[PDB]
Write a protein that binds this ligand. Sequence first.
Ligand SMILES: COC1O[C@H](CO)[C@@H](O)[C@H](O)[C@@H]1O
Ligand SMILES: CO[C@H]1O[C@H](CO)[C@@H](O)[C@H](O)[C@@H]1O
Ligand SMILES: CO[C@H]1O[C@H](CO)[C@@H](O)[C@H](O)[C@@H]1O
Ligand SMILES: CO[C@H]1O[C@H](CO)[C@@H](O)[C@H](O)[C@@H]1O
Ligand SMILES: CO[C@H]1O[C@H](CO)[C@@H](O)[C@H](O)[C@@H]1O
Ligand SMILES: [Zn+2]
Ligand SMILES: [Zn+2]
Ligand SMILES: [Zn+2]
Lengths: 138, 140
Amino acid sequence: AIKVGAWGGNGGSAFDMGPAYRIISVKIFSGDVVDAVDVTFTYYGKTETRHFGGSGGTPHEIVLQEGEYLVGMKGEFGNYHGVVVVGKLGFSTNKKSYGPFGNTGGTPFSLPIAAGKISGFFGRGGDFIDAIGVYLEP
Amino acid sequence: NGAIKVGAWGGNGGSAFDMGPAYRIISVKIFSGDVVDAVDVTFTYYGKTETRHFGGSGGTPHEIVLQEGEYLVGMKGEFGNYHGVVVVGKLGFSTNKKSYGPFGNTGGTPFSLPIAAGKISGFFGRGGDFIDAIGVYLEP
Ligand SMILES: COC1O[C@H](CO)[C@@H](O)[C@H](O)[C@@H]1O
Ligand SMILES: CO[C@H]1O[C@H](CO)[C@@H](O)[C@H](O)[C@@H]1O
Ligand SMILES: CO[C@H]1O[C@H](CO)[C@@H](O)[C@H](O)[C@@H]1O
Ligand SMILES: CO[C@H]1O[C@H](CO)[C@@H](O)[C@H](O)[C@@H]1O
Ligand SMILES: CO[C@H]1O[C@H](CO)[C@@H](O)[C@H](O)[C@@H]1O
Ligand SMILES: [Zn+2]
Ligand SMILES: [Zn+2]
Ligand SMILES: [Zn+2]
């Protein structure tokens, strides 16, 4: 019901995991660009994992503890050899800050969440994370 | 009390402001010179039509009058240093009908809030002489 962003480019193909009950972990694969994200989450009594955007890079796992929620997403998007992709990507929880991951500067974006949380993702993916957006909940 | 509050984009200067969410944003008026000086918002609180005056006195007004079917589904801008203070130097909004702005002429670190689903229902931020910062309430 509340979907924000898609920051990135038009390349790759669409993904959309919808909202979750709880995000368990977010694993950003990155080298000089953001290659991919794995999200594992619970959904109506089940645990699920998705992986958006290609093989590539080194993994950086954010694991969410008991009362921990994603309250921020930040990054940069730009042209990496002909595709507009997320060159840098970071997250913050109520407890700590992570990243950003990736080494390619571009047009910055930032989503601080003064009230609410990130409950899921949508965007575009191919060889790399072309774009990323976020579902929000109270 | 989801209010879902997104942002504050800008500096830590000035005094905090927070209008809460509205039943309906009637119009948003952005005061603008080489920086964003202020925002006035006229909206319907609980039966009543109030307006709030955020930021400072300012430069030149630019009014976005929303029409019945028209909702705010986007906010973009840039924040930067302006004589020793980090303020919003550029600010723009898009609705489901039209796109307004950006207003102001001081470039800086860009931000953007495309709302693929939902809309802006209210405003908060920081204000002094200019718009130090601005954020937004979201609802479906
Ligand atoms: C920003 O991109 C990287 O930085 C992280 C964090 O150190 C590394 O783990 C990763 O391999 C990349 O070199
Ligand atoms: C290299 O080819 C691809 O990978 C990039 C980056 O994800 C995409 O934008 C593109 O559409 C293809 O999927
Ligand atoms: C250029 O080499 C790298 O950067 C890319 C893009 O992020 C990764 O796929 C790869 O594993 C290396 O880290
Ligand atoms: C010039 O003095 C002030 O105006 C700026 C910009 O609004 C503020 O941060 C600051 O705290 C004071 O209120
Ligand atoms: C420097 O002159 C101006 O720019 C400032 C900041 O926007 C405004 O306060 C003033 O009204 C003029 O428009
Ligand atoms: Zn994976
Ligand atoms: Zn790591
Ligand atoms: Zn006013």
